[PDB]
Design a protein around this ligand. Structure first.
Ligand SMILES: *[B]([O])([O])[C]([C]C1=[C]C(C([O])=O)=[C][C]=[C]1)[N]C(=O)[C]([N])C1=[C][C]=[C][C]=[C]1
Ligand SMILES: [Ca+2]
Length: 263
């Protein structure tokens, strides 16, 4: 419950590796505070929000339909696919795949969606085309979690991710309906309980997306605020440590407690 930047630096002291952090005012885009804002970190599963941003952009362009049903085989399944592995017969709609990728971190869902847009290179092009010249996706799930330092593959920076997330959620890039659908999926996140959500007071809004590598790395991106409306964006990444998952979770939770206390 220290001052937030103090807590972030403390988390890095305890974990080893690097911790990156930024808080943006949602309305203005103003940077409120940051630590290692321009350094690269692996996105891990946080990329799944950007992926669904690209899918929605295609919907807005009349090139995709959220209701379109996709079928796949057992051979398409990769690890960490809790939703898709249950629909080998009936398949899933594009919208259902985005819900699964975002709310359950479903990897096969993400890969199927990557296929719809033309792969990691096209996600990167989508990002470049909306003004993010930093964030890059190079690999599919699960290889994108490899997190080699000093590998620039599959990385973002706290400020690039925060800025891009803000544009996807509030900008004129997506239609109002699509911006709302994206934040709705994030609001319905099911797997980030131990992170920022654990520090969230009653009545607050949060829409988020977490990510993990087996070893060394963790992250979360979020739009949150009091009184049922988001008012800030928070991005936290960690990488390059030997910290346990429990330790990584705890530090993010404590960073969350600090940023709430000192809101
Ligand atoms: B993702 O981080 O690219 C993916 C799926 C995953 C997400 C989350 C989360 O908090 O959203 C937690 C765990 C896994 N990561 C992986 O596929 C990675 N190989 C992995 C798998 C299991 C546990 C840790 C990392
Ligand atoms: Ca340090």
């Amino acid at each position: 419950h220290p001052e937030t930047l103090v807590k972030v630096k403390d988390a890095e002291d305890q974990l080893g590796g690097r911790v990156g952090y930024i808080e943006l005012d949602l309305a203005s885009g103003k940077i409120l505070e940051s630590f290692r804002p321009e350094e690269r970190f692996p996105m891990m599963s946080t990329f799944k929000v950007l992926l669904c941003g690209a899918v929605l952009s295609r919907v807005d362009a009349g090139q995709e339909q959220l209701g379109r049903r996709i079928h796949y085989s057992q051979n398409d399944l990769v690890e960490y696919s809790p939703v898709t592995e249950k629909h080998l017969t009936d398949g899933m709609t594009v919208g259902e795949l985005c819900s699964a990728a975002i709310t359950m971190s479903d990897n096969t869902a993400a890969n199927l969606l990557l296929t719809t847009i033309g792969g990691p290179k096209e996600l990167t092009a989508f990002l470049h085309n909306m003004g993010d010249h930093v964030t890059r996706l190079d690999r599919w799930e699960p290889e994108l979690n490899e997190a080699i330092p000093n590998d620039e593959r599959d990385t973002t920076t706290p400020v690039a991710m925060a800025t891009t997330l803000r544009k996807l959620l509030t900008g004129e890039l997506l239609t109002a309906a699509s911006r709302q659908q994206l934040i709705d999926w994030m609001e319905a996140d099911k797997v980030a309980g131990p992170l920022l959500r654990s520090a969230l007071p009653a009545g607050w809004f949060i829409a988020d997306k977490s990510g993990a590598s087996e070893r060394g790395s963790r992250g979360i991106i979020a739009a949150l605020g009091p009184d049922g409306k988001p008012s800030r964006i928070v991005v936290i990444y960690m990488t390059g440590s030997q910290a346990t998952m429990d330790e990584r979770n705890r530090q993010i939770a404590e960073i969350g407690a600090s940023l709430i206390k000192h809101w």
